[PDB]
Structure formats: C-alpha cells, structure tokens
Symmetry: T
Subunit: 150 residues, 12 copies
C-alpha cells in the first residue's frame, strides 16, 4: 500500500459515501427532517469536493484514479445497503457517524503513509480533510447525545 493506491482507495470510498449521503437525504423522516435534509446537501457538496481533490492529487503525482461505479464498489471499504425497512433519524445518523469514523481512521493511516513516502502535499491535504471529519463527528455525535470519542 503506497500513496497512489491509498488515494485511489479513498476515491472509491468517497463515491460510496456521497451516494449514502443522498440515501439519508432522500429517505429521512421525523421532527428533524428540515434541518438534517439541508445538512445532508452540505455534506454531499463538501465530500463530493474532497473526492475531486483527492482524485486530482492522485493525477498530479502520476496516478490513475478509478472512474467507474464498478471500480468504486470493488475497491471501497465503505459499506452500503439498500433502503428497505424504515429507519429512525438516530439510526441513519449512526450509519453516517460510523462511516465518518471509518474515513477518519483511514485518513490517519494515509497521513502516516504519506509521512513515510515524504509526500508533504498529500500529507497536508489529508490533515485538512481530517479536521473537517473530526468536527462533523463531534457535531453529529452531539446530535445523538454522545461524546465524540464515545
């Protein structure tokens, strides 16, 4: 696992994540619909923005990003499930928080990986993305009544 492979892995993860954001965006119900419906729009834009930046950083270091839905499913560690039985707002947010923690930890791995290879630019890019993920984790856990690391 080198920097190129790690970045391509995150390209796949983020494409699975943004579609999951749309899933929550579409199917949510409950008293918090209006607040959290718009909030998902914000997350979709932000993480869609991360995905393009990760892909273009991969391009800038000589890599070739995955560019099909097939490649995303086959390579993503982020998990998706179709929407079958109705779910509560808390359950949807727990799926979202779980995926955010996944991305956080994988970004932690990439940060160390890039420190190893001497890739300072990619290192700095991932740190900034992780800062936002940590903030979202605190906020969405606070929504669930929990502490960030609980």
């Amino acid at each position: 696992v080198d920097t190129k492979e790690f970045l391509n892995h995150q390209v796949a993860n983020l494409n699975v994540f943004t579609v999951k954001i749309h899933q929550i965006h579409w199917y949510m119900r409950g008293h918090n619909f209006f607040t959290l419906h718009e909030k998902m729009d914000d997350l979709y834009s932000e993480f869609g923005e991360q995905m393009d930046e990760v892909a273009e950083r991969l391009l800038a270091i000589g890599g070739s990003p995955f560019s099909t839905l097939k490649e995303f499913l086959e390579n993503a560690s982020v998990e998706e499930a179709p929407y079958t039985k109705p779910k509560t707002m808390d359950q949807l947010m727990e799926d979202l928080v779980g995926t955010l923690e996944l991305l956080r930890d994988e970004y932690k791995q990439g940060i160390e990986l890039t420190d190893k290879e001497g890739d300072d630019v990619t290192n700095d890019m991932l740190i900034a993305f992780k800062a936002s993920i940590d903030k979202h984790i605190w906020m969405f856990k606070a929504f669930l009544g929990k502490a960030p690391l609980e």
Copy 2:
C-alpha cells in the same frame, strides 16, 4: 414500464453519467484541456441536480429511489468502461455525446409515458431536462465539427 420505474431508471443512468463526466474531467489531454476540463465541471453539477430532482420527484409520487451503487449498476442502461487505453479528446467527447443522445431518446420515451399516464408535473420536468440535453448535444457536436443530428 410506469412513471415510478422510469424515474428510478434515470436515477441510475444519471449516477453513471456523472461518474463518466468525472472520468472525462480527469483523463482528458490535448490543446483543449482547459476549456473542456471546466466545461465538465458545469455538466457534473447540472446533471447532479437533475438526478436529485428526479429522485425527489419520485419520492413525491410515492416511489423509492435507488440509493446504492449496486442498485445503479444493475438498472442503468448507460454503459461505463474503466480507463485503460489512452483516448483522445475527440473520443471522450464522442462517448459523452453518445450518452447524451441516449438520455435524450430515453427521456423522449418518458415524456410520452407520462403524458399517457396523466402525470403532468413529471412530464413537464422531463421536457425541461430534455431542452438542456438538446442544447448540450448541439454544442458538443459543433465542438466535434458535426451537426446536432449527425
């Protein structure tokens, strides 16, 4: 085929299309890079909004939109191919124009389907989208040196 499934089919198509737009966005090379790189950014946003609007119109009439990459692959008539053999700007644009022509013709069907079923809102929505698709087809063919219906 009824209105609900047609809309869901396009939800799948548009998700494959936007990823194809990113593919062209990322891998394009040649003298026209800067113009078409930015042009792909515009198309990605516009068709991302068509996808969200179609999904939410489907929700509004009692449907349940596909919300996973797995469901998109199984249901999309738009075809994708990983990027292995380096393609020219003309070939990437010819692939793009092909998918636009595909979506136009499929929307052409949906418009008749919805006029028959008496769904006036979904009918008008599809016409507005087709108007934009027809304009893009003309413009990208002109870029390729071709006439719109060639």
Copy 3:
C-alpha cells in the same frame, strides 16, 4: 366552470392559505420552533407570489380578480378556524398538509380544465405550481413520520 372562474377561485384560496400560514407562523410552539417558524416565512412568500401570479394571469386573459377579504371568504374552499386552544406542532403541520393536498387536488382540476379549453399558458402555470406543492407535501409528511400519499 371555465378558466377565469377557476383562477379567481384560487385567488381566494391562496389569500386564505397565506393567512393560515401566518397563524401557524405566529402561534407555533415546541422544539422545532426555530426551523418551522422560518419555514413558514418561506411558504408565505412563495404562495403570496403564486397568488399575485394567478391574479395577474386572470387579468391577462380578460378576467377580474377578487380584491377584498369579503370576496376571499365568500369564495374560498380553503377553510380557516380562529386560534383558541393551544395546538401542538404536529396539529399545525397536519392542517398545513391538508390545505396543500386541497390545493394540489384543485390544481389537478384546473390543469385538466385548462388543457381542454386550450389555455396552454395557464395550464403550464398551474403545473409548475403543482410541482412545488407536491414537493412540500412530501417534505412535510416526512416531518410527520408519514409517507407522501399516506
């Protein structure tokens, strides 16, 4: 019933609706106050704009719009009730959804009526209004925990 009578009927309906929106805007209580208070401001503007458009389309086809509260009360199928006992947030939203469903179904009548009479502009105007009403119905039902047509 002809096109002029239908549009004038909706002029009365929409004036009753916007005042009902103000009632909910003013008297609402509960944990969702801040979100739904602001949301009611948005609805007030949108349907006040529909009302002005309907009246001016009526003017444009030779009609004479109702222009007094007296005429609005006498002609509106939308029903209003003074605010005496404290209602819950859910009860206000159920009244709002009910009135939206009323306007949706009556607009459906106008759409068929205007298609028959060959009034293409008014037909398209009513379809656009219905598109928005259907979206609001989906969103507010989701807030109540219910499906759009349930």
Copy 4:
C-alpha cells in the same frame, strides 16, 4: 382600549390595507401605470412587514393576534370595497391616501396610549411606522397636486 387590543386592531387594519394595495396594484390603468404598479409592490412589502412586526410584538407581550380573514373583517376600521365600476388613478390614490391618513391618526392614538401604559418598546415601534406613513402621505399628496395636510 389597552395596548394588546390596539395592536390586534392594527393587525386587522394592515391585512385589509395590504389587500387594498393589491387591488390598486391589479386594477390601475393610465399613463402612470408602470411607476405606480411597481410602487404598490413596495407598499405591499413594507406594510406586510409592519403587520408581521405588530403581530409578533403583540405575541411578545402576551397577546394573541387575529389570524383569520373572519377576525380581520370583524375588527378592522379600515374599509374595503369590491371593484365593480371603473376608477381613475387619482381616485385610487385618493383611496390610498385616505387609508394612510386613517392609519396615521390611529397610530397617534396608540402612541399616546402606549406612553400612558408605559410600554416603551411598542411606543417606539409605532413612532417609526408613523414616520414612514407621514412620508408616504407627503409623497402621494404631492402626486395628487396637494400639500401634505390639505
């Protein structure tokens, strides 16, 4: 009358006034149409905003605003008349000026009423509204060729 009843009386007055502004907005004819048509939109917005502010100030002091067309008609001292016989621009403006003068004098009463009851906030709110009304009175009388207090 106490402060709560006075404010509620004005809630009814302003709802009748804004509908009257729309009446002039819709039915006006003559060479001054384009200027005064747009001018009525400005007045509609401003006095619609006055109405919301009055109602919410009433809410802030423990009151319960009228929230139906029925209650507005029953309580308003402002008079409305259906539009049956054609009227001139000057006659419409003279109807508008009369209502502005009505609101001014009633606001002056409320200003003295609120000074007596020691409601300093409501006192200041009504003074600011009167400032704008006095300016409109000067301008529309000047339009009519008259002095402000003529």
Copy 5:
C-alpha cells in the same frame, strides 16, 4: 413545419428588437424616463427570446436567418421609418399581439409534430407576451383583449 416556424420568428424578433430601439430613441413626453428604461428591459428580454429561438432551431437541425436581408424577406412584423407616447405604445402592443397569435400557431404546430421542447419554449414566451399585453394596454387605458 417547426423549422420553418422558428426561422420565421428569428426574422420577426430581429425586426421587433429594432422597433423597440426605435421607441426607445424617439419617445417624448411625461413618461419618457419610465418608458425609456422599460424599452431597455424589453430589448434584453426579446433579444434573449431571439437567441433562444435561433439556438433551438440549431438544436433540431435547422439553419437560422442571420442577415438583415433575410429578416426583411421573411418577417411578418412590420416596420416604418420615423410620434406621441400613445402612438408608439399602440405600435408596440400591436406587434406583441401579432407575436402572441403567431406563437399560438407554433404551439399547436409543435404539439402535432411531437416537439415537446419547442412547444414548451413557445408557451413560456407567450406567458410573458400576455403579461406585457395586459400592462401596456392598461397604460393606454384599455382592457387586455380590447
């Protein structure tokens, strides 16, 4: 057919926008400042309708007229070299009524051929024309259909 109708309107709208400039330039009277600015608004709107019509024609395989020569030969809209404000506005309302009625023909013409996009485009344009007809007739003291 649709191509012939759209190209016909390209000629009409080019004659119309020049007529709008004519009113814009020559008007006099107490309503000068309001209607002078109003004509700029109409010039932009109908100049934009013209561009949309021409490019819709392009999008369906047509070739729009693109010279003053071609506009004069094909336009049903009438122009006259160079009035009171009322005379200019009645010339304007007449052309708006002309364009409205001709658009009605195109709407039914396109409904037949199954061109829903061009159909929808013409309806939206007619909506604006009907609104202008009401407002300018009201300026003249008249009812919309009078």
Copy 6:
C-alpha cells in the same frame, strides 16, 4: 445610581452573557443541536454588538467602561457556573431565557432611569435592545413549549 453607573453595569452583564452563550454553544447536545448551535452564534454576535455599543455610548457621555474579566465578575448581576455535570438543551435554554429575562427587567429600569435624567440617546438605545430581547424571550419560550410571560 445614574446613567454612567447603569451602562457600566450592563457592560459587565453582557461580557458574562456572551461567555455563557459560548458555554451553551459548546456543550449543547440533543436532536436540536444543529439549529441551536447556529442560533447561539447569532446571539453571541448580537449581544457582543450590544456590549460594544453600550461601552461606546458610556464613553460618549464621559464615562469609563470596565475592561477586564476581574471587573466584570465583581460587578455583574448575571451569574455563571462552571460546567461540571451534563445538562440538557432545555436546561441550557432555561438558563438562557432566565438571563434574558434578567436583562429585560434591568433594561426596563435603565429605560425609565434614562428618560428620567433626560438622556434621550441612551434611552432610545436601550429601548431598541429591549425590543430584541423581548422577541428572543418569546421565541425561546415557544421553543420550550411555554408562553412568553408564563
């Protein structure tokens, strides 16, 4: 007491209040987190603006505002408590509403006091602040399910 002494007292009150707003802003949890997190930022800015205006009005009449945390603690009638055991959104909001009610009542004193000594500028300033405070009291009590007075 006099006007100078009153304004300096509120400078201390408002500095304690804004830090309390940050406390609620930071520690809040529950389903209403996203709405009320943003709302606290708005309150922080508005009451931060009141504090600067009060201090600069005190300067304008020859006074000397307190300008240290030491002086604020010594002079503020608003009470603060460190955050040891967790509390709900409702308890935080009831603490917030309590402090707003305090400021409302103390401003009522200043409004009569300043009109009394003939300080018309400071009188008008305090009325405008109370107008906003009364509105916040109404809105946040409505959030709590209560009437303004309750």
Copy 7:
C-alpha cells in the same frame, strides 16, 4: 480667465446647481412626482461628484478652491431664487434645463480655454462632464416634449 479660475467658477456653479436640484426635489408636485423625485436624487449625486472632482483637479494644478457658501454666491453665474410662488413640474424642469444649458455653454468655453493653455487633463475631464450634460439636456427636453436644441 485662466484654467484655475474657470475650475473655481464651476465649483461655485455646481454648488448652486445641487442646491437647486434639492429645491426641485423637495417642492415638485404633480402626476410625475415619483419618477422625477428619484431622478433628482441621481442628478444631485452625479453633480456632487463633478464638483468634488473639479475642486480636486484645481488642487492638483496648484489652485485653491472656494470652500464657503459666501464665496459660492459671489462667484457663481448660476442663479437661484427662493421658492414662494408655487411652480409647476414643467417650470421646475424648464429651470433645470436652463441651468444645464448654461453649464454646457460655460464648459464649452472651458474646453477651448484648456486646449489653448495646453492642460490636457483638465480638457479631457471637462469633455467627459459635458458628454453627461448633453445627455441630460436631451432627456429632460424629451420629458418636456421638446427637442434637445430647442
């Protein structure tokens, strides 16, 4: 007459003109009030900027601009009259057009004066101002029913 004095003369003229613009702004009556009231606001601003620019161009070439009302009255060729006998909109506009024609002709002289003296900057500045004056003369004459050079 040299460049410095000509500029100072116009400093006096423009200060008298803007006050005359306010006079028309304040006292105008008739059906055209709203349009011309706002139009006077535009003229006041534009000619206030001409005055400041002329004064600062005078400063830049070593001059000393008049800076008191006393100096303006003694040096201005533009004439003012207090408002006693009620004037019509036409008469106020005819007074305005007269002063514009005055300024045009005096600037006409300054342009030749500065071309002779070789002051290219001041020459170009006066031409730009005259361009605006000529346009206003045409527009206000058209308002009066007249041709520009009538």
Copy 8:
C-alpha cells in the same frame, strides 16, 4: 421658535456644515491626510443624508424648507470662514468638533421643543441624529487627545 422653524434652521446649518466638511476634505495636510481625507467623505455623505431627511420631515409636517444658498447663510448659526493661512490637522479638527458640539446642543433644544409640541416622529428623528453626533464627538476628541466633554 416652533418645530417647523427649528427644522428649517437645521436645514441651513447642515448645508453650511457639509461645505465646511468639503473645505477640510480639500485643504488638509499632514501625516493623517489619507485617513482623515476619506473620513471627511463619510461625514459629508452622512450629514448630507441628515439634511435631506430633515428637509423632508419638514415637508411632511406642512413646512417649506429653505432651498437657496442665500437662505442658508442668512439663517444658519453654523459659522464658516474662507481658507486663507495654512492650518494644522489639529486646528481643522477642532473647527469640526466645535461645529459638532453646536449641532448637538441645538439638537438637544429641538428634542425638548418637539417633546413640547407632541411631535413624536421629529423627536425620534433628532435623537437618532444626536446619537451619531455624540459618537463622532467622542472619536474626534479622542483623535485630539481629549475626552468627549472636555
């Protein structure tokens, strides 16, 4: 001296004041030129704005504002002197501060005068203007090293 005469007196004062602001704007020299040159532009706009509002309030209560430079000089208590010998930045600012204190005290008189006549609107207008004058007095005295009331 009644409200009408007082307002007309201030119309004259402010026209003398704004020309004085231009005098300072034009002739100032020293290290503080760039900061204070722009600051005078701000004061010119603000007090020019006060003048129009005062004049139009006079119009709204039946008065007739002075509208010539002649009337301003003859009625103004604000004093002007042509610019002869060079002056320091401190001296120019002391002339400005002196005039501000003059306007403040005269506005104090008008506030009491309007309280007497029961003119609540004009009373409120003058208080707001005085608030700004008091702030400028503090700031410009601070520039001179002095306290506001020193």
Copy 9:
C-alpha cells in the same frame, strides 16, 4: 457632417451585431465554447456602442435610422447569408478594421467641427476596436497590422 457620420455608424453597427450573431450561431470546431461565449461579449459591447452612438446623435439634434430598411441602405458594412472558425474570424477582423478606419474619419471630422464630446466618444470606441483587432489577429496567427 457629424450627424451624417453618426447615423452612418448606427447602420454599420446594426449590421455588425447581426453578423456577430451569425458567427455566434454557426461556428464549429475545437474553439466553439470559447468563441461562442466571446461573441456574446462582443454583441453586448457593440450593441452598447450602437446605443451610445444613436443617443449622441439625438443629443446633437439628429434623427437615428431605426429600421432594417434604413440600415441596409446606408451601411458600408457587408453581410452575406450562410464555415470554418478561421473564415468567420477573418470576416470579423475585416469588419473591425473597416469600423476602425471609418471611426478615424469621424474623429478628424469631429475635431474640425469642434464637437469634442463626439470626438472623445469615437476615440474610446477605437481604443477597444484596436485591442480586439490585435487579439483576433493573434488568434489567426497574424500580427495586428498584418
């Protein structure tokens, strides 16, 4: 005289803006997106020059041409019904060079008559035309005066 020159340009610019639309509509090739948008910019700029010229003519006592009829009869700018990108751009550069040289005549013509405002107006327009001439010639691979 000045009136005759300005009215002549009213006809020229109306033919020019329609030619700009012609290029805007019919262009094809790899530069489509850039030059399609560029033509919209030129249409606005020269449409604005046309309005300024007509209203300056009005301001000095003239009467601007206001019909397609009058434009064709008086315009020295040439139009042809409907190319490669190079052919369209060379047609555009030619008209820009035409307008430049004719404006030079008006500048000296107005200097004589002592019309400094119209003189200054034409100079500012020529400044923009010269810049466009450089840029479009560079696009064609050529030097500005080549």
Copy 10:
C-alpha cells in the same frame, strides 16, 4: 501536560486577550485613533475566531473547554490590568505586541508538543494561527518604529 490541557489553556488566554483588545479599542487616543480603532475590531474578530476554533477542536478530541470568566482568570498566563491612569497608543500597542509575542511563544510550544503526540490536525491549526500572529507582530512593531525581533 498534553494537547487537551494546552488547548484549554489557550481558550483562557484568548478570552483574556479579546477583552484586552476591547480595552485598547475603547480607551485609545491620539492621531492614529481612526486607523487603530478599526484595526482593533479586526483583531477582536480574528482572535475571537481562534478562540472558538480552539474550543471546538478541544471538543472534537474529547476535551471540555473552560466556559466561565472565573475559569479564564484562574488559568490564563495572559495578564490584564484595569484602566486607572491614562496611557498612549504606543503603550497600548506595546502591551498588545507583548501579548502577541506571548501567544507566539506559547503556540510554538503547542506546535512541537502536538506534532510530538501525533495530533496532526491540532498541529496544523496552531501553525496557521502562528502564521497570522507572526504577521501581526511584524506589522505592529513596524508601527512602533521597531524591527520584528528587535
């Protein structure tokens, strides 16, 4: 010590700093008043933003920020003094530069400390803050006539 303990220490420092900024903002006098009065508003906003970001970063890693003036005084290494005897702009600025140098040196500690414990997000955040602090130190020392270090 560790990262949590460091961030909470700076929360206390920054709360003392912003009140000190207000102190300088309020009491400053001299020829540079207008420039530095505005500059202090900018500093108040920026360092107010640093405080919120530090507190929310502390929350994101599981910490609990101090949230009372009591806790701020007890923990801040930044020193405050009430304003008894007058001081110059230079002495106020030297107090400001001193506190900035303090924050610079303490942030240097945190930057090495957080890189050490592997907190990459907090490390990057503190570097960005120090970048701005170093710039402020350079600029304000240049104002004082001194070199940055010195």
Copy 11:
C-alpha cells in the same frame, strides 16, 4: 522618438516603479504604517494595470514590448536603489513622489508626441494616466505637508 519607443520606455519605467512600490510596501516603518502599507497595495495594482495597458496598446499599434527584467533595467529612466539603511516614512514618500513627478513629466512628453503623430487613442490613454498621477502627487505632497507643485 516615435510612439512605439515612448510606450516601450514606459513599460520599463512602470516595472521599475511597481517594484519600488513593493520596496516601500515591505520596508516602511512608523506611525502611518497601516494606512500607507495598504495604500501601496492600491498603487501596485493601479500601475501594474497601467503597465499591462501600455504594453497591450504597444502591441495594438504593431510594437513589441520589453518582456524581461534585463530589458527593463536597460531602458528605464526610473531609478532604483537597494534598501540598506533604515529610511523614514517621509523619505520613502519623497522617493515615491519623485518617481511620480518623473512619470508625469515623461507622460507630458508622450502626450505632445502622440498628438503630433495623430495617435489619438494613445494620446487619450496617456492623458487618463496623467490625471491619476496628478491626483496622487497632490495627495502625497499634502501628506508631506507641502503643496502639489512645491
């Protein structure tokens, strides 16, 4: 010397000037730092824009602009000196005014030269640039306590 040679000469002058503006921008110290630091940014943009315009006007008339630092040094009449000893704010401003006076006088030559050659566009371009230079000369001399031509 012809038009092409003059414009190219100014291309070299302006590139030396903008770097000199940066020198003052970077090294300045003293109480006026914040105002004049920002002012230098404004000058840098304006004269960088003049430089681009001059070069592109040279291109437009068939010329070939200098495009290297080597060519700029070889051709510039504007003089530069490395920064060794600390200069005062006044000394930097005296160097700036000196260079402005140089550009003013040389532009005067170009204005006469281009009037003779019949290059009306370049003539007008240079006049506009001189208008700005003359204003800067007035303002910066006033900062130094001197008259514009002294």
Copy 12:
C-alpha cells in the same frame, strides 16, 4: 542556505517568473489565444501573491527581501530570454512548464530545509504553494499531451 536566504532566493525567482508570464501573455499567438491569454492573468495574480507572501514571511522572521530588479537578476535561478524569434504556443507552454518544475523542486528543497531548521510556519507556507504548482504542472502537461511526470 538557511531559511532567510532561501525565501529571498524565491522572492527573486517569482519576480522573474511573473514577468515571464506577462511575456507569454503578450506574445502568444494561435487558436488557443483567448483561453491561455486569460489563463496567464490568473497565473500572474496567483504567483504575484505568492511573491508578496514570501517576502512578508521573510520580513516576519527578521529578513530583508530583495527589492530591485538588479537584486532579482543577480539572485534568480529562474531564467528569462527576450522575445526575438517567433515561438509557438506549445513552446511557450513548455517554457512555462519548465519554470513550474524548477519552482517545485526548489520548493521541495526549502520544505526539507525548513523542517530541519524547525520553522513550522514557513514549512507549511511552502507546502501550500507546492500543492498549487503540482496542480498547474498536471494541467499544463495535459495541455501538452503528456503525463505530469513525463
């Protein structure tokens, strides 16, 4: 080389680079003129901003930036050549890409240099600049038909 000398070396490099960007901006010809002409303006602004940031960071750590064309030529490793023989768009872009690669590699050296000297702020600044340079390298090589590291 230490940090101060490295930053000063880049001050010289960037001034040579921006002038080179202008050279390409001015002399370019071919079908890609309009896109790349505007693109050079963007690059001119960005790297002009990099230059100011580098110089001011050098100032913040006690350094003295080069501030003359003489000093830039003497210290720059970036090479410039006058434009005598015509060049193609590709050759101009290849000159641009070469300089970008130069700056990247030299910035990488500075990044390691600053990590060694413990200058965390300057380290982060150079990393961010390198991120942008790497992106430009990918895009302009793609324009040339090549891979980023080819």
